[PDB]
Write a protein that binds this DNA or RNA. Structure first.
Ligand SMILES: [Mg+2]
Ligand SMILES: [Mg+2]
Lengths: 119, 60, 123, 56
RNA sequence: AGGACCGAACCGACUAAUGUUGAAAAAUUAGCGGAUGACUUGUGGCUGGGGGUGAAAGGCCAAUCAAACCGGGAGAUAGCU
RNA sequence: GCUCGCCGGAAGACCAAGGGUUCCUGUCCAACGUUAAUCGGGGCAGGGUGAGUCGACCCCUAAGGCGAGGCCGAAAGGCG
RNA sequence: ACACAGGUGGUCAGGUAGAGAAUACCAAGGCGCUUGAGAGAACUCGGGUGAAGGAACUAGGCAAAAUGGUGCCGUAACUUC
RNA sequence: AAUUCCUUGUCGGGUAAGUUCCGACCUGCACGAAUGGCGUAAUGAUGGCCAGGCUGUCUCCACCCGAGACUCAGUGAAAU
RNA sequence: GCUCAACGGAUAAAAGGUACUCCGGGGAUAACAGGCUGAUACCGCCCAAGAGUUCAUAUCGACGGCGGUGUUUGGCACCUCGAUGUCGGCUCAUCACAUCCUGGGGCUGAAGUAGGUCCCAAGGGUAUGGCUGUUCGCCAUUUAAAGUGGUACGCGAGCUGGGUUUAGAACGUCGUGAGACAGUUCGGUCCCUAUCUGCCGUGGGCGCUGGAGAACUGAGGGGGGCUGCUCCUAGUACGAGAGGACCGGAGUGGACGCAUCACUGGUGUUCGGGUUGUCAUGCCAAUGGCACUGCCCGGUAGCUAAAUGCGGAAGAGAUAAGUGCUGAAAGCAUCUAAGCACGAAACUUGCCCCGAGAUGAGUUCUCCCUGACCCUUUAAGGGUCCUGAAGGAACGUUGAAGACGACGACGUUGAUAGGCCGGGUGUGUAAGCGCAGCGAUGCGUUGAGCUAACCGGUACUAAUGAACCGUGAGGCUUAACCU
């Protein structure tokens, strides 16, 4: 049982759940919209919808969790320089989910995740 | 009770082992000589009887 | 909560140092007992000349538990030593005289008004 | 572990009784591209709730 | 100096869980012993079945050994199913 | 292409042994591949291995193998 | 008998830590092992932690737990010294 | 006694309690001197017994981490 | 001319071992288990020699006699040998009553306390260790008691493999020997993915005669039932004292079961800190990856017990054994025969849970539907054009609900999640900046910084217009009313 809990194992250990959302959030900020599976969007609603909580407000010391589980600093230079001032008044809900048919080779239910203000 | 001789289902699945004790004194007497229990019980009757004659004797 | 095979220390000047519980008394199938309780114990270690001997089988009352006893406020009283006070088998009264270390308020009774009067510290 | 008789093919119909599929009830029609798609899903063209939610 | 010492490779296979239509017609995982010698391993060479070989257990001799395999006597023989 | 993960006295490089086109391109997806496959050690069709000095051959010889004659043995043969 | 968790000889020996060809993390270099994607019940397979107790368990402290390096001090019986 | 039936022989030790073990006892059912006898340091993945340490062995099990099981796609056996 | 004597005579002439083993066959034939049998066994009964001072019959019972049980050992060789896995343990059991504790009695060689034996009673309860393959037993210490048996002497397609029961090896012993020992000692592979039946859960279908939404009733079924101890009564009754009650009452335990996370804890690999070696981020400073989560230190929610609340009843009926009351048969007597009372954890209830597929499909309560025509084998008829209600499912967000299904909440009116703000929470005073110190490091900002599941808010995102499904007043028969 998982009463009142929160978190999908995703048939992976926690060190790979760590390292996968590194690149998945690491590329959504780049292209503003990507194709992923729907449980890697719906558990990612516990992840990427908090990984935009990562994108709130610039200090000097706030350049750092976006280094930490990202291993990247270029995308850091995109978030608080461009996207922080972009989503400057939205109090949550910075994304949108588009269930977009099923994956070919395994019938996996895919979806599109994206930003709210993509244009 | 059963003996623990070799043979198994001829030994351990039968009550070939006897033990006869005394009520007012408490003197046991076992026997596991032959396969039959009445070659043992009746033998342990004799051995308790052999103890019994000594009970007056060893005392006196 | 003391089961069998449990080494306990000694809380009086009886003469023993290491005892071991061999039976929890006082109840049918009574698996455990805390403070204010009676257990049959043996003696595993005693002084070279005392009131006791290595291997005496006798009763004792449990006075300090590492496990804990609760109070109606919710406060639970634990210790860091598991010691006990040796009793007679028949009169079932303490044999030693000089009580070592503090004890608790659950110990007091008509049966055990004697020990708390000799205790150095009662919480 | 394993059967002791041959199973009847009539039982094989009864085991496969609940094993049937189920098709879709009704397809959500788009209101701008005017085409059927899956309910709560986008169209094939890239429309959802009327608007063009994705340039393909 | 050592049929010395701890311990890699190497060599062995003692315990335990696995696995038992297996990953595998004997293996893995954890440990274990030996690990300068009565060591280990290449390339060859030799010994042939009532024979071989054997720090010996009836062991081993092409996944088979109290008498190897293949062919033949031979449609052995069967008071038995 | 971008990160990420693993190996690294190897899960890297290199040969013998052994394999005997698997190698390189083009093409194809029926079968083959424990799924798809647009891919492939798959099919099909083309290519591709250059030596006085490297290896073999070759000159030696060991364990050994054979053996003129020779010896022995019904015969076959045994030993040399 | 498989694109088989096996077996197969020789040559090659980068950095840091390290006695080390141990181990760790790595370089060069090479791969992510031919079904996936979900769900997060029992249940086994592996794992980690555990109050108080500490062998009572059990055929049996089996396995687990624990011990573990380098210096230095110190070290019994007995000895075939 | 790796040998003793009786036999859990008896006594001592050890344990709260010991059909085990360690000392004796000799009544050796049926030891015994190169199919050697007795003893023996060192040795042993050798047999038994006892202690300390140690701990989910256990009391008395709880909780997480993964690999399957279960759901959906693709494929798809088996003994009987 | 033959103890050819195994004497209708296999040859003039012939012993063993095989656990290294093998073939052919057999339930024609052994070992376990079933079967019949009940000798033996066990358990009762009859007689009463006697013991018990006297007193057979409180307690016992010689000599004998009669049964019951299938339960000991056996007998038999009917099932099974083209396989029916056995000792003990472990895990789970369930049944009997010939009752171990508790309950109810009778008698006593029963003052009480304590027993004795007998009867009723199977609801519930009914130890841990040491020894040993164990069983059994002994012992230690418990307990209210440590019941006895049936169950393939229950249970290996559940586990264990110590014992027995392979091959290795040895002693004692026997045999010249190969070898063997109901003689020991060391070592020695426990397979099976569940078709059915059965069981535990959980669905689908159709039915219950218009449809839908609900509430129930409760046929029936299940669960549950144990007990100590202290105190009062009371040192009272009793007894010479010692000793020490009935009944009734109170309190606290044990064991068990249910519920639970407020507490007390564990766990908490997604919260946080410390720290080792290395690698990378140009480089410092910072971080991060990997090293069992690298090694620790802690901790939220959740889940949890060792954490804390309940639970066993009281009561009613009918009784068992037993005690009676009136009372004839039987001028008395007499619990019975007519009548009649009392009487136990058994019974039925009372307690909880399940429950109308209770086909005997029940009940009450609420909502929905008042369109047109053809056909002929003219009717519970078929078909066609309008109509699509109540509601339902589907879909999405979801859950302290869950294998899946099902269940529950919610779908813009909207707080269903996620995000966001607030809050708490927990690691434990961040980073950068200063400052001191040769430096490591310390101090200033500083419960700062961070913060998983949580508490309060927020539509910020994602929960779509539709469509689908289900329709259009509901058979016959009498009956009763109303007209
Ligand atoms: Mg089927
Ligand atoms: Mg009777």
């Amino acid at each position: 049982m998982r009463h009142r809990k929160s978190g999908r194992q995703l048939n992976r250990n926690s060190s790979h759940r760590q390292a996968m959302f590194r690149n998945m959030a690491g590329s959504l900020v780049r292209h503003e919209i990507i194709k992923t599976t729907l449980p890697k969007a719906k558990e990612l609603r516990r992840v990427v919808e908090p990984l935009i909580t990562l994108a709130k407000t610039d200090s000097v010391a706030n350049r750092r969790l976006a280094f930490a589980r990202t291993r990247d600093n270029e995308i850091v230079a995109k978030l608080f320089n461009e996207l922080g001032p972009r989503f400057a008044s939205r109090a949550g809900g910075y994304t949108r989910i588009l269930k977009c048919g099923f994956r070919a080779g395994d019938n996996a239910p895919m979806a599109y995740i994206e930003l709210v203000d993509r244009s | 009770y059963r003996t623990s001789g070799a043979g198994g289902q001829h030994v351990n699945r039968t009550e070939s082992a006897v033990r006869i004790t005394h009520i007012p004194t408490g003197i046991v007497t076992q026997c596991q000589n032959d396969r039959s229990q009445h070659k043992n019980k009746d033998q342990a009757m004799k051995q308790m009887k052999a103890k019994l004659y000594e009970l007056e004797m060893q005392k006196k | 909560m003391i089961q069998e095979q449990t080494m306990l220390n000694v809380a009086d000047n009886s003469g023993a140092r290491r005892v071991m519980c061999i039976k929890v008394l006082g109840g049918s199938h009574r698996r455990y007992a805390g403070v204010g309780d009676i257990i049959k114990i043996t003696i595993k270690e005693a002084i070279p000349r005392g009131k006791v001997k290595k291997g005496d089988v006798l009763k004792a009352v449990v006075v300090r538990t590492k496990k804990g006893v609760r109070r109606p406020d919710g406060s639970v009283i634990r210790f860091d030593g598991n010691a006990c006070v040796l009793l007679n088998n028949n009169s079932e009264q303490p044999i030693g005289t000089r009580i070592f270390g503090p004890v608790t308020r659950e110990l007091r009774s008509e049966k055990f008004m004697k020990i708390i009067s000799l205790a150095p510290e009662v919480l | 572990a394993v059967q002791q008789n041959k199973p009847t093919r009539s039982k094989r119909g009864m085991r496969r009784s609940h094993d049937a599929l189920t098709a879709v009830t009704s397809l959500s029609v788009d209101k701008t591209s005017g085409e059927k798609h899956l309910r709560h899903h986008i169209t094939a063209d890239g429309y959802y709730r009327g608007r063009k939610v994705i340039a393909k």
